[PDB]
Design an enzyme around this catalytic site. Structure first.
Site, PDB file in Angstrom:
ATOM      1  N   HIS A 126      -4.480  38.444 -39.611  1.00  0.00           N
ATOM      2  CA  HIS A 126      -4.513  37.475 -40.740  1.00  0.00           C
ATOM      3  C   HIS A 126      -5.933  36.939 -41.009  1.00  0.00           C
ATOM      4  O   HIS A 126      -6.112  36.221 -42.014  1.00  0.00           O
ATOM      5  CB  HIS A 126      -3.502  36.366 -40.531  1.00  0.00           C
ATOM      6  CG  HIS A 126      -3.795  35.384 -39.452  1.00  0.00           C
ATOM      7  ND1 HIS A 126      -3.172  35.454 -38.225  1.00  0.00           N
ATOM      8  CD2 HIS A 126      -4.527  34.247 -39.446  1.00  0.00           C
ATOM      9  CE1 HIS A 126      -3.592  34.423 -37.485  1.00  0.00           C
ATOM     10  NE2 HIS A 126      -4.429  33.695 -38.223  1.00  0.00           N
ATOM     11  N   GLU A 146      -0.336  42.356 -35.240  1.00  0.00           N
ATOM     12  CA  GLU A 146      -1.209  41.175 -35.522  1.00  0.00           C
ATOM     13  C   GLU A 146      -2.544  41.271 -34.793  1.00  0.00           C
ATOM     14  O   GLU A 146      -3.269  40.260 -34.812  1.00  0.00           O
ATOM     15  CB  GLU A 146      -0.461  39.877 -35.184  1.00  0.00           C
ATOM     16  CG  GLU A 146      -1.050  38.642 -35.866  1.00  0.00           C
ATOM     17  CD  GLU A 146      -1.186  38.693 -37.381  1.00  0.00           C
ATOM     18  OE1 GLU A 146      -0.447  39.509 -37.999  1.00  0.00           O
ATOM     19  OE2 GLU A 146      -2.090  37.983 -37.925  1.00  0.00           O
ATOM     20  N   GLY A 195      -7.066  26.155 -35.893  1.00  0.00           N
ATOM     21  CA  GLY A 195      -8.395  26.234 -35.282  1.00  0.00           C
ATOM     22  C   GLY A 195      -8.374  27.040 -33.986  1.00  0.00           C
ATOM     23  O   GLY A 195      -9.476  27.386 -33.546  1.00  0.00           O
ATOM     24  N   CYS A 248      -6.642  30.047 -33.521  1.00  0.00           N
ATOM     25  CA  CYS A 248      -6.343  31.487 -33.716  1.00  0.00           C
ATOM     26  C   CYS A 248      -7.539  32.303 -33.249  1.00  0.00           C
ATOM     27  O   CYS A 248      -8.730  31.960 -33.492  1.00  0.00           O
ATOM     28  CB  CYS A 248      -5.913  31.824 -35.141  1.00  0.00           C
ATOM     29  SG  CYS A 248      -4.251  31.164 -35.496  1.00  0.00           S
TER      30      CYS A 248
END
Length: 182
Positions: free
Chosen positions: A41, A72, A146, A148
């Site tokens: 992402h 992911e 904050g 990730c």
């Protein structure tokens, strides 16, 4: 403060960079040579900022499992003038549960941040922001925006990167040794 934080610090101090995309700042784990990982992402493009230096992206691959399900993890090869310490021997070979993990973050906002998240479950399937995702690790810590890209470690192993939360639980994408064989 103890051997868990010691191992986490050793990874952060030599194998992380701050990555900036158009979607914000992320902790980015460098694995070997010029190869690093980041949550998919983050939407890596042709150019990325690495510790505030404009850096060409030589290759970027959003990983999926052989069921064609999102994992992911994006593997990025950076046009950087320096190699990472090779940490592939700290990656697990198989999917597993863990005790006594640390989530470690380094951004402009959250420098030198270490969180003892405790027991880590092999959760498996997660609908992550609407996207079916496999190989998810879960910990019972109220992770926030904050974090990730944050690195999940145990003593002696690097097991995942933080990719989401639901306010009560945090979720990481597994790192497996087979992702980085050459």
């Amino acid at each position: 403060m103890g051997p868990g934080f010691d191992f986490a610090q050793a990874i952060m101090k030599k194998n992380t960079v701050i990555a900036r995309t158009e979607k914000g700042e992320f902790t980015m784990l460098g694995v070997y040579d010029r190869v690093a990982v980041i949550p998919t992402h983050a939407s890596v493009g042709e150019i990325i900022y690495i510790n505030d230096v404009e850096t060409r992206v030589l290759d970027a691959c959003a990983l999926r499992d052989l069921t064609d399900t999102n994992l992911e993890i994006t593997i990025v090869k950076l046009d950087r003038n320096q190699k990472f310490r090779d940490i592939r021997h700290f990656l697990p070979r198989c999917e597993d549960d863990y005790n006594d993990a640390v989530l470690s973050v380094h951004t402009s906002k959250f420098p030198n941040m270490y969180i003892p998240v405790g027991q880590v479950t092999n959760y498996g399937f997660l609908n992550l922001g609407g996207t079916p995702t496999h190989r998810i690790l879960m910990y019972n810590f109220p992770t926030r925006a904050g974090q990730c890209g944050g690195v999940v470690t145990t003593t002696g192993k690097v097991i995942g990167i933080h990719v989401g939360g639901n306010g009560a639980q945090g979720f990481a994408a597994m790192l497996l040794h087979s992702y980085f064989t050459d």
